Design a protein around this ligand. Structure first.
Ligand SMILES: *[C@@H]1O[C@H](CO)[C@@H](O)[C@H](O)[C@H]1NC(C)=O
Ligand SMILES: *[C@@H]1O[C@H](CO)[C@@H](O)[C@H](O)[C@H]1NC(C)=O
Ligand SMILES: *[C@@H]1O[C@H](CO)[C@@H](O)[C@H](O)[C@H]1NC(C)=O
Ligand SMILES: *[C@@H]1O[C@H](CO)[C@@H](O)[C@H](O)[C@H]1NC(C)=O
Ligand SMILES: N[C@@H](CCC(=O)O)C(=O)O
Ligand SMILES: N[C@@H](CCC(=O)O)C(=O)O
Ligand SMILES: [Mg+2]
Ligand SMILES: [Mg+2]
Lengths: 448, 449
């Protein structure tokens, strides 16, 4: 499997969903789906970019260059584990990712055996806060103990007393929904229908899911989905097949948030949806770098050629990765600015990388006092010690966010409440209608 | 540097057994295990040694090819099991026996499958493991809980009940078991009245509500199917006592209840008449003949024996690397293993899992090395992907005379005992054996119920 590398004194591993997960039938041979931009290429480039800057920075890690070994997780436990084995087969100092809680648990179960700290940028499961089971895990995002509370507050806000519940099979949906149901039970909120499903389940399964939900109408119109985006898309698609529109009031978790790829093509069935988004400021710095990448000068990113052809539905003559679905040759001058959309969690990806650097810096200050570069004490780097320095690190993120971790490796965070609506213009957009921070729900009622 | 039980041979079979209890929660990061175990540990380690000795003396099974072993401790925990599984992939292991727990077996299989190493379980019963897209290299000689659902439904249909309530304990066991029951029930025209789930540790208030919801469906739905942990049943019995009701329902429970006294202890009156399922556990006399004769000074192939002996007979071994600090008297070495002796209830499964591995290797040899006495180039090294194909199609007669074979998903047939709680001729409540579910056929003594 391809691997994006950058040499340096200390090597940082990373796991990103460069491709979609393998089709249910291909799982055994671990053959992945199509190339991804927001969750794949953009994150791979964000790592390269962040490391470039850090290595060009005189204050952070003065004479210590950070290298990398970026691997594809295909958002799947089996591929992620396969690739994590490669990390431990210069030794990896720490790992960034993967994005899924279930997948993250699989990776952490192996990494902890070699004392390799892991920092997530999107794994929000409450379970990962258990340090007896996940000692070497930390993250720059808040656990879903909060998101579940935010979701219940929204339901309470609009006096909904009877709701249906759906979650994506796996640790993220299961842990999040269990927390929500626990809160609901305390508050006396009734759950009409409850169901679960795998994001990659067949259409017949999503058909069944939808049918079961409709049967609980019209009393159970509100549907709480602690779901991955693809699970939500699977449901919209099922609504498309049955010819139904606007029957439910969907309230989704961060797997949906304000992601365009989730509702693309199904804006009609998705319209009116209310979602939760992890607050993360747009990273302009990244756009300036990313949009200037060219298919001829970007050689450090092994997947770029595959990406370009897919991004511009064109093919590369003679290229081994020539796409057999497009005829118009790639002019190699197409603009990455067309319909461009930055990964919604870009800030977290970047700050997770910076957290790793700050951990290494803090460790160097303590173990190699007065030394210029790495000293005997950090040759090799002791993962167990690096973990403690990471947990005790605090800094200002790429966009001003205060980043630090509590004893459980959890970071502070908050959410933006989004509402999908048909704007004045002939277009559907994610309107920012509110926020949830420290138990306080603020929603602009006139905006909804 | 965790100890390993070894026996060299032409082909090495790996094994993961719970030689020790899992690490206390706070000792998990350091993977420091608990107390030594006998039935789930030492007895299984010895069962493997004994079985291999027997197979190596068997003129019909692998006549001129010896089997060896690399037995590791799983401490009934995924971190230790993974730690030890890493050691297997670090002579290469042809296959792995174990581990015992489904959640732990899943973690082990996620890794083994990456190296095409077939894994055969003797006690992991999770329905999840039947998914070959996720667990291609997993097979087992113990039935999947989906067969418990089947047996329980067969019991319900036998007495022509049309409506039943359904309760299951939260978690994989309870939820998967009940989902299986419900799928079958729907397909066969059985209606579900009240349906619920609950944690065994839920409060009395929660069990009070559960009982109220069940009673609301009376008298039409007098039968309650419980795919539950024993303590969930106990919670329900406890609620019946508080409410002051008796014999209103006919409870049918999965093996979480089985024939456990701790479940009905003090609530025999409200439990009386319940029907439960239990995995059959045929005693393997030949194992006892071997195990009961083991001695401290001569058993040097089992590295955990010294520790086991000290704990088993509450004595210490002066200056031993693992000298038990809880007892002052010294072991004589002539204590008898027969005192309070109890044979691991899964012993037959453990032995048959080992025999299944041997038969898969034998079948592979016959097909890939025809005419060769020993292993030929086609089996140097053994192609795990091929061994998996041969294992799946292997069948034989087990240690207790049962027929062992696997379906396409690597699942095994199921044989359960059917119990009925009754008040015997004496002033006592006993779990009376009233039937069996023999691989699809329900045999019940209708008069005893
Ligand atoms: C440290 O790195 C800087 C790069 O800006 C270089 O100019 C300087 O000479 C280096 N110092 C040492 C002691 O290597
Ligand atoms: C919820 O119900 C209360 C009580 O009837 C009412 O005062 C409040 O305005 C309602 N809020 C919404 C959003 O409907
Ligand atoms: C194979 O094993 C049998 C059974 O003990 C033995 O009689 C025979 O001599 C062996 N063959 C060889 C070539 O060693
Ligand atoms: C179940 O119903 C069938 C059909 O009437 C009947 O033949 C059979 O005897 C019944 N069994 C019992 C145990 O009542
Ligand atoms: N927070 C989700 C991931 C959502 C997403 O990034 O799409 C998880 O922990 O799995
Ligand atoms: N069947 C249980 C294990 C039972 C036992 O041996 O204690 C499981 O799948 O985890
Ligand atoms: Mg620097
Ligand atoms: Mg033999």
């Amino acid at each position: 499997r391809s691997v994006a590398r950058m040499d340096g004194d200390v090597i940082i591993g990373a796991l990103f969903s460069v491709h979609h997960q393998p089709p249910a039938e291909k799982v055994p041979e671990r053959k992945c789906g199509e190339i991804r931009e927001q969750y794949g290429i953009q994150r791979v480039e964000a790592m390269f970019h962040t490391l470039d800057k850090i290595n060009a920075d005189p204050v952070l890690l003065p004479n210590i260059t950070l290298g990398s070994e970026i691997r594809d997780s295909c958002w799947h436990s089996s591929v992620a584990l396969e690739q994590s084995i490669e990390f431990i087969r210069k030794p990896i100092a720490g790992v960034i990712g993967p994005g899924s809680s279930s997948v993250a648990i699989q990776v952490q179960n192996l990494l902890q055996l070699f004392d390799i700290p892991q920092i997530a940028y999107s794994a929000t499961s409450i379970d990962l806060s258990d340090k007896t089971l996940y000692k070497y895990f930390l993250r720059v995002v808040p656990s879903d103990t909060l998101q579940a509370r935010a979701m219940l507050d929204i339901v309470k806000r609009y006096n909904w007393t009877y709701v249906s519940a759906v979650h994506t099979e796996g640790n993220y949906g299961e842990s999040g929904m269990d927390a929500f149901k626990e809160l609901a039970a305390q508050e006396g909120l009734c759950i009409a229908h409850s169901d679960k499903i795998y994001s990659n389940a067949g259409e017949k399964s999503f058909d069944r899911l939808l049918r079961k939900l409709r049967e609980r109408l019209p009393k159970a119109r509100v549907v709480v989905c602690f779901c991955e985006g693809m699970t939500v898309r699977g449901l919209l698609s099922a609504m498309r097949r049955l010819g139904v529109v606007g029957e439910f009031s969907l309230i989704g978790s961060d797997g949906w948030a304000d992601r365009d790829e989730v509702i693309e093509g199904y804006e009609v069935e998705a319209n009116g949806g209310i979602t939760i988004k992890l607050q993360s400021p747009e990273v302009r710095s990244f756009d300036d770098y990313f949009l200037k990448l060219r298919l001829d000068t970007n050689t450090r990113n092994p997947w770029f050629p595959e990406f370009w052809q897919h991004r511009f539905q064109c093919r590369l003559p003679g290229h081994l990765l020539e796409n057999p679905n497009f005829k118009k040759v790639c002019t190699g001058n197409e603009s990455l600015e067309e319909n461009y959309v930055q990964d919604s969690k870009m800030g977290f990806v970047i700050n997770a990388i910076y957290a790793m650097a700050h951990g290494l810096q803090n460790m160097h200050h303590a173990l190699c006092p007065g030394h210029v570069g790495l000293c005997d004490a950090m040759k090799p780097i002791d993962g167990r010690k690096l973990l403690d320095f990471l947990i005790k690190s605090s800094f200002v993120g790429v966009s001003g966010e205060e980043v630090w971790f509590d004893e459980k490796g959890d970071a502070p965070g908050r959410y933006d409440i989004m509402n999908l609506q048909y704007t004045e213009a002939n277009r559907y957009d994610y309107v920012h209608v509110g926020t949830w921070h420290e138990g306080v729900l603020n929603i602009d009622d006139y905006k909804i």
